[PDB]
Amino acid sequence: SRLSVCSKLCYAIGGAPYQITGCAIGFFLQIYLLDVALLDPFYASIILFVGRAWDAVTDPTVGFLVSRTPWTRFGRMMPWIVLSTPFAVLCYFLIWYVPSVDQGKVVWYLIFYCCFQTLQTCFHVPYSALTMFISTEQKERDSATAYRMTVEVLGTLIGTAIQGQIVGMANAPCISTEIDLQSTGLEVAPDVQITDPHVSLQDLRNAYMIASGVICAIYVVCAVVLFLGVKEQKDTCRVRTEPMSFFQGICMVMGHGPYAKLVMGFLFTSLAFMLLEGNFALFCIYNLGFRNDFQNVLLVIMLSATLAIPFWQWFLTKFGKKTAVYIGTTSVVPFLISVVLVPSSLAVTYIASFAAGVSVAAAFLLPWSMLPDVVDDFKVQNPESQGHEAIFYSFYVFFTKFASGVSLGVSTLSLDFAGYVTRGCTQPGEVKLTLKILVSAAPIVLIIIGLLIFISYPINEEKRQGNRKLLNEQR
Amino acid sequence: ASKLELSGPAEPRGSKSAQITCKAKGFPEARFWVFWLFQRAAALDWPAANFSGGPVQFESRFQGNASLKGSQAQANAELNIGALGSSTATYRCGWKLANGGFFPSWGGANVNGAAGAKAPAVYPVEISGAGTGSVTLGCLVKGYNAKPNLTWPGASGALTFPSELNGALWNLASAVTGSGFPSATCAVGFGAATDVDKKVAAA
Amino acid sequence: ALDINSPEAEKNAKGARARITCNAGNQVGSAVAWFNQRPGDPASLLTYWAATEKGVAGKQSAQGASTKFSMSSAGPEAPSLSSYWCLLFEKGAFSFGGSKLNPREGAGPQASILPPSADLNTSGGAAVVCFLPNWYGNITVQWKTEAPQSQANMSWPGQAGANAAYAMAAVLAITKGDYGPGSFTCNASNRGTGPFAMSLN
Ligand SMILES: CC/C=C/C/C=C/C/C=C\CCCCCCCC(=O)OC[C@@H](O)COP(=O)(O)OCC[N+](C)(C)C
Ligand SMILES: CC/C=C/C/C=C\C/C=C/CCCCCCCC(=O)OC[C@@H](O)COP(=O)(O)OCC[N+](C)(C)C
Ligand SMILES: CC/C=C\C/C=C/C/C=C\CCCCCCCC(=O)OC[C@@H](O)COP(=O)(O)OCC[N+](C)(C)C
Ligand SMILES: CCCCCCCCCCCCO[C@@H]1O[C@H](CO)[C@@H](O[C@H]2O[C@H](CO)[C@@H](O)[C@H](O)[C@H]2O)[C@H](O)[C@H]1O
Ligand SMILES: CCCCCCCCCCCCO[C@@H]1O[C@H](CO)[C@@H](O[C@H]2O[C@H](CO)[C@@H](O)[C@H](O)[C@H]2O)[C@H](O)[C@H]1O
Ligand SMILES: CCCCCCCCCCCCO[C@@H]1O[C@H](CO)[C@@H](O[C@H]2O[C@H](CO)[C@@H](O)[C@H](O)[C@H]2O)[C@H](O)[C@H]1O
Ligand SMILES: CCCCCCCCCCCCO[C@@H]1O[C@H](CO)[C@@H](O[C@H]2O[C@H](CO)[C@@H](O)[C@H](O)[C@H]2O)[C@H](O)[C@H]1O
Ligand SMILES: CCCCCCCCCCCCO[C@@H]1O[C@H](CO)[C@@H](O[C@H]2O[C@H](CO)[C@@H](O)[C@H](O)[C@H]2O)[C@H](O)[C@H]1O
Ligand SMILES: CCCCCCCCCCCCO[C@@H]1O[C@H](CO)[C@@H](O[C@H]2O[C@H](CO)[C@@H](O)[C@H](O)[C@H]2O)[C@H](O)[C@H]1O
Ligand SMILES: CCCCCCCCCCCCO[C@@H]1O[C@H](CO)[C@@H](O[C@H]2O[C@H](CO)[C@@H](O)[C@H](O)[C@H]2O)[C@H](O)[C@H]1O
Ligand SMILES: CCCCCCCCCCCCO[C@@H]1O[C@H](CO)[C@@H](O[C@H]2O[C@H](CO)[C@@H](O)[C@H](O)[C@H]2O)[C@H](O)[C@H]1O
Ligand SMILES: CCCCCCCCCCCCO[C@@H]1O[C@H](CO)[C@@H](O[C@H]2O[C@H](CO)[C@@H](O)[C@H](O)[C@H]2O)[C@H](O)[C@H]1O
Ligand code: NA
């Protein structure tokens, strides 16, 4: 009656497409809308903000609809996944498709981005809930969650690598504006662009379509693996959702001290790093000058995060979790200062990419290490606890999924205000200043806010929480 | 709404200089590149562009001939043209889109680099002793240096040909295909008075 | 600079459909705008990025991928019979090509010669005026006293609103001392398989 290793592998693989599509979108959608779709950056800001705000809004609504799903012959979560996968991959393919429309291309991208976010929610939320139905024993659920949290990292790495190495192989020409007309008396005639395997804008669009097709094929294959290898057990213990009690427990969780502190801290730190994820490709292309090697920079960051997860696990098991979260978020601050203060040296950018990957691994690993010390304290403080960490996560996901959309929309609107040239050879000084601020001022401010919230942390690592763990032995 | 108000027509001389203004309304002028164009009975040429809070970028043909200036305390742009002689054209100011490179709004201001100001001479060119059904009359307006206004008394068969340069003055012709010919007169209208109406006689 | 050229400066256009072509000297990556200019008015933006309209009617569409672009009208109207320009915004030096639409009509030329008046002969001048008021297409005027001459100034109006036909005025300027040999003939060469000659003695 134990949960099979192959069943846990299939369950973990079923969560790869969410991270593949999320990393591909969050790292390349802004530059696709600005330089490949050739949209006005006001429209691109609208599209990004509305898509992520709809990603968030649809999370609790689809969760509530999933809570009311009856048990069919195939299960309670499998019908949603199966009936949502083909429409989700169709909408994802049409996200990166450029229609031949005379007007309202922004409407096309809004419709398909919001539809894909809705269908990906209808895939993930039943998937996220599936871990309570795969096995009755909590240990098997924890093992499957370890398999998942793990692949999830591998899927982010694989999606970043695939999108970067496909859409980065086929380049395209760029627009030269009046700022690029810096030579008229010299009259330089270095006609070397023609003596090349001439790439076009349509070649770049075809590369984006090929990357989307590969990601959709992986989505379909992993959905098939998740459907075949995972079967719901239909356990007798079925606790009701109780939405009024859910709201009461949400208010109780937000009223708790350490829980609210963890939220505010993580929220702000993840917001800074999502702002970096959004406006870092443009910073590499137009400030660092790596319009051909920005995908390699992103891959180096992802590889650094993957190799720095065990380092930060050793750091938290050895030197505690207070100094770990005090230095992990602030490690990127000197390098975020250094990238905008040097004349774009390649070695400096790669070293800062490695350090930024290390900091990302710390920032997205350490709060999950802190979380059991908060759960024990909440159990000591509130003996009655029925689904508090689930709504705590829901709150964190919603607020990150809304404020990251707000941040990305504000960033692209600021780029429009600064005069961002649609696939320009070089951006003007205002756009480069905005891109420097969006990676070295706003993320540093958000990291400082999150660090100040994490300083006011009454748990004080295990030094009280372990005592609360003693009370966990008492109750 | 975003609009650009320009100075009126200018009539400089061969070796003078002419400054053309362009007042910008409805948008921050310092945030956009204001462009100057050149249309001389032909396609649109491209003198230069000016960022009103920064640099000016010229075309190599107009370097040393054009000079672009921007008064951001007035939200105004200026195009100063140096030595003249073939710069008689229409100049349009238009602010660029901050992203694309095309010109949404446009201007229009005429420059006529000629010399002299004379009263037109009206000659009643008529038939040469022939007639078959409808007959064609005419009126020759020769030797003026402005825009004329030729009219016929209530007859709508006129074809007023565009004026042309002969030396430093303008020539123009009018033709009316009148069937019955009891009496016809050519009345012209000029800016420097001289509203002369001459009747067209036979032979 | 990047060369932009419209192959047809004038396009005869009835209703139904009409396509205006633009050719670039370089692969501009669909960075082509289309402007419409009416007489006495500045250019008005119609299309940008070779496909996107700017508040224009739905008849004005545009296609084109690289080095070859087209602007189409779903149905031409009376306001649509104006001049059209294609601009590049690929490189910093911006260039145009120029093209115009014209209504379709029949044919049939005309000519009439007029000698200098007595008032002009009084004030030391002699202008012989040839009027070609109604024809459709392109025409040429030759002045012959005894041999062809190249001392004539020629002017052409646009296309008539009612007749949809063109006109032409050819003025031969000649002094009183140059009014010696005598007879002047004006010869017109339209699509009529023969030059129409109007002469005076
Ligand atoms: C000097 C170089 C600086 C470089 C910057 C590049 C930076 C950061 C890269 C990434 C941040 C996000 C990637 C990590 C994913 C975490 C894996 C995970 O399993 O954790 C997430 C889980 O909690 C889901 O929730 P999440 O809110 O994060 O979803 C947000 C969705 N939305 C976009 C709409 C906001
Ligand atoms: C190359 C890409 C590599 C990138 C690096 C960025 C970061 C390091 C990431 C590290 C570890 C992964 C962290 C995974 C986040 C949690 C997984 C997740 O995305 O969470 C989904 C949620 O829906 C399921 O877990 P749960 O809700 O139960 O959260 C409460 C957990 N628990 C109750 C057991 C305490
Ligand atoms: C170039 C790369 C070279 C090398 C690296 C090899 C890499 C693999 C990369 C990644 C996989 C690592 C996944 C790490 C997951 C971090 C999360 C974690 O390891 O732990 C989270 C903790 O939050 C779980 O919670 P907990 O265990 O207490 O379960 C019950 C909780 N609760 C009682 C409240 C319900
Ligand atoms: C991208 C396309 C390529 C994908 C190719 C498919 C790769 C699939 C990954 C399989 C990796 C197997 O991973 C390995 O599985 C074995 C089972 O045999 C597990 O085995 C171990 O865990 C289980 C559960 O605790 C124990 O019962 C077992 O005694 C122990 O040996 C390990 O947890 C793991 O190290
Ligand atoms: C578009 C992307 C979104 C994906 C949405 C997918 C949600 C799917 C909703 C669940 C399916 C609803 O359809 C469901 O089918 C089964 C038939 O076996 C029936 O449901 C019934 O199943 C069995 C009997 O067969 C009994 O437990 C019970 O009588 C009833 O629950 C109902 O007809 C309906 O409740
Ligand atoms: C599994 C993932 C892979 C799935 C692959 C599916 C193929 C996707 C290729 C895109 C083909 C769709 O191409 C798109 O079609 C629609 C309708 O025809 C067009 O849309 C056009 O027609 C519709 C008519 O209702 C109007 O809104 C408007 O005239 C215009 O938007 C787009 O201009 C075109 O770009
Ligand atoms: C193509 C799209 C992306 C698809 C990516 C698929 C890659 C699959 C590679 C194998 C990933 C699974 O990796 C898996 O991670 C977890 C980490 O706790 C390990 O699981 C291990 O921890 C759990 C819980 O402590 C225990 O059951 C046991 O100790 C062991 O199984 C497995 O030993 C390992 O096999
Ligand atoms: C664990 C699963 C995840 C695996 C992640 C890594 C798998 C994919 C590794 C491919 C890495 C390719 O590494 C690099 O990519 C870029 C673009 O593609 C290319 O780079 C090449 O072209 C660019 C052009 O400016 C220059 O940097 C240089 O000429 C050369 O390096 C080469 O292909 C390769 O030098
Ligand atoms: C598992 C592997 C998954 C791989 C999935 C790969 C599927 C996508 C492959 C890319 C092929 C795209 O093919 C490409 O499509 C576009 C439009 O659709 C065409 O583009 C053409 O259509 C429109 C017409 O309005 C114009 O904008 C364009 O100028 C014209 O060239 C290209 O001529 C064609 O080469
Ligand atoms: C065209 C796109 C589709 C391409 C698909 C390519 C990948 C396909 C691989 C799918 C993984 C197959 O996974 C295989 O399925 C069988 C189901 O009989 C599972 O076998 C097991 O399933 C569940 C485990 O909870 C048990 O109830 C069952 O008793 C047991 O046999 C295993 O998980 C695995 O042996
Ligand atoms: C919810 C929060 C979302 C997170 C993103 C918010 C980060 C802020 C976006 C960056 C905007 C600042 O971007 C930068 O600001 C300065 C003013 O301070 C402005 O600077 C510009 O305008 C001023 C005029 O006042 C000029 O003197 C200056 O030469 C010019 O560069 C520009 O706007 C831009 O260069
Ligand atoms: C979350 C909801 C967000 C608020 C809802 C959106 C309200 C605004 C919708 C768009 C209305 C007009 O859109 C805004 O106005 C001008 C027209 O003056 C548009 O047009 C502008 O860009 C285009 C090129 O892209 C130029 O051809 C044009 O000359 C220029 O004025 C822009 O596309 C946009 O800046
Ligand atoms: Na996740």
Numbering used by the authors:
A (entry chain A): 33 to 507
B (entry chain C): 1 to 203
C (entry chain B): 1 to 201
Could you give the paper's own sentences about this structure?
Mfsd2a is the transporter for docosahexaenoic acid (DHA), an omega-3 fatty acid, across the blood brain barrier (BBB). Mechanistic studies revealed that Mfsd2a is a symporter for Na+ and is selective towards long chain, unsaturated fatty acids including DHA (22:6), α-linolenic acids (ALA, 18:3), and oleic acids (18:1) that are covalently tethered to the zwitterionic lysophosphatidylcholine (LPC) headgroup. Like other MFS members, drMfsd2a is comprised of twelve TMs that pack against one another with the substrate binding channel located at a cleft between the N- and C-terminal domains. Here, we present five structures of the Zebrafish (Danio rerio) isoform B Mfsd2a (drMfsd2a) in the inward-facing conformation determined by single-particle cryo-electron microscopy (cryo-EM), in the ligand-free state and displaying lipid-like densities at four distinct positions modeled as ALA-LPC.
We expressed and purified drMfsd2a from SF-9 insect cells and discovered that the protein copurified with endogenous phospholipids. We therefore modeled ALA-LPC into the four distinct lipid-like densities termed Lysolipid1A, 1B, 2B, 3C (numbers and letters refer to the lipid and LPC binding positions). Initial data processing yielded a 2.9 Å resolution map with three lipid-like densities representing three merged ligands, Lysolipid1A, 2B, 3C. However, our in vitro analysis indicates that there is only ~1 phospholipid per protein molecule, suggesting that the lipids observed in this model is a merge of particles of substrates bound at three separate sites. To gain more accurate assessment of how drMfsd2a coordinates these ligands, we plotted the intermolecular Lysolipid2C- and Lysolipid3C-drMfsd2a interactions using the model for the merged ligand map at 2.9 Å resolution. In drMfsd2a, the four lysolipids are positioned along the vertical axis of the substrate tunnel within a cleft between the N- and C-domains comprise of helices 1, 2, 4, 5, 7, 8, 9, 10, and 11 that open to the cytoplasmic side. Since Mfsd2a transports lipid-LPC from the outer to the inner leaflet, we propose the following order for the four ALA-LPC during substrate transport through Mfsd2a: Lysolipid1A, Lysolipid1B, Lysolipid2B, then Lysolipid3C.
